[PDB]
Amino acid sequence: ERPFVIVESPDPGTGGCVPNTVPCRRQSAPYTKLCCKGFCIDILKKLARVVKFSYDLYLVTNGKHGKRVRGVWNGMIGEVYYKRADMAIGSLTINEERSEIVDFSVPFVETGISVMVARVSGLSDKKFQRPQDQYPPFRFGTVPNGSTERNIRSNYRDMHTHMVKFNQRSVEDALTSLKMGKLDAFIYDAAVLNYMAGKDEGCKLVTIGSGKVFATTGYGIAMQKDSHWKRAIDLALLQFLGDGETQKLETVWLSGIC
Amino acid sequence: ADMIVAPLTINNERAQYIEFSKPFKYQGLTILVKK
Numbered sequence: 001e002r003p004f005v006i007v008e009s010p011d012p013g014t015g016g017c018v019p020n021t022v023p024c025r026r027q028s029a030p031y032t033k034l035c036c037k038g039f040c041i042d043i044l045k046k047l048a049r050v051v052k053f054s055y056d057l058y059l060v061t062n063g064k065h066g067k068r069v070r071g072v073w074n075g076m077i078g079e080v081y082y083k084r085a086d087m088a089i090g091s092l093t094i095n096e097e098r099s100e101i102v103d104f105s106v107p108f109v110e111t112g113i114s115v116m117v118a119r120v121s122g123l124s125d126k127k128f129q130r131p132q133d134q135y136p137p138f139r140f141g142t143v144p145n146g147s148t149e150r151n152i153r154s155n156y157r158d159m160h161t162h163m164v165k166f167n168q169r170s171v172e173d174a175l176t177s178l179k180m181g182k183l184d185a186f187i188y189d190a191a192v193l194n195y196m197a198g199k200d201e202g203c204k205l206v207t208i209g210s211g212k213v214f215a216t217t218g219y220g221i222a223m224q225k226d227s228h229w230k231r232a233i234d235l236a237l238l239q240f241l242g243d244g245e246t247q248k249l250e251t252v253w254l255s256g257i258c
Numbered sequence: 259a260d261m262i263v264a265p266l267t268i269n270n271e272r273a274q275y276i277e278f279s280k281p282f283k284y285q286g287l288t289i290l291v292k293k
């Protein structure tokens with residue numbers, strides 16, 4: 001995903017990769033040894049020492065976060081629900097549908113739904129509320145299989161119906177298409193878009209800013225239901241957040257130029 | 259008492275004893291100055 005987690009191939013400098021990184025395997029019997037680095041990796045490494053527990057990290061196979069197709073849950077949520085893992089670190093938004101089955105810790109960063117446009121006055125604006133005027137035909141984001149997709153589909157039928165003709169390849173192709181002009185607006189998570197404008201060719205920006213945040217929530221750590229690990233990790237992470245190093249990690253990994 | 263509904267922030271010491279629910283409005287600490 002976004003710089004919370006980054007996958008890098010080992011370098012021939014040492015027949016591997018240096019410290020400040022942890023080996024990670026791409027599951028699928030044979031495996032190639034990669035090593036993963038990022039924000040969540042750093043927070044996990046910092047957490048491990050205090051509570052003194054062992055860990056092994058492995059990637060997801062099916063991918064695409066989480067979904068519920070007739071109870072067939074894929075992704076990290078699918079992996080943790082069927083008792084195939086103990087925790088699922090990384091990008092994950094706490095909402096009503098997910099929390100029914102799997103327990104969560106406290107949030108550590110702020111996030112939500114934002115809007116990205118090329119260089120509108122909120123969700124309830126008539127442009128997104130009344131798609132019937134043909135002279136300003138706008139465009140949207142809506143990376144499918146997304147957490148926000150469920151919300152926008154559940155809350156506004158007309159927008160979901162009119163969002164069919166939307167660019168959908170990645171958080172990379174949308175930026176290129178917007179820089180081209182093949183679309184008009186983009187909607188996705190907040191903590192990733194506000195960073196994505198941090199270091200970009202020129203200065204592409206968003207609307208008013210953090211004042212325009214919809215369904216404000218945070219990222220969290222999932223865990224199997226009814227385990228002492230849940231309480232232990234939650235209290236430890238609260239103590240760490242109260243310490244204040246989270247700001248240092250943020251300024252190390254979440255700073256931009258524009 | 260049995261329940262607290264007030265602007266009560268969360269910290270380690272209080273988290274040691276009582277159990278909290280999910281938060282509903284984020285904030286911080288800021289300085290008040292007179293113009």
Ligand SMILES: *[C@@H]1O[C@H](CO)[C@@H](O[C@@H]2O[C@H](CO)[C@@H](O)[C@H](O)[C@H]2NC(C)=O)[C@H](O)[C@H]1NC(C)=O
Pocket residue numbers: 064144145
């Ligand atoms: C969500 O993830 C699923 C699982 O990988 C993808 O499944 C596709 O679903 C569409 C119909 O929605 C089928 O036409 C494809 O054949 C399925 N497989 C693939 C590989 O695309 C799906 O693409 C993702 N997105 C949506 C909107 O379902």
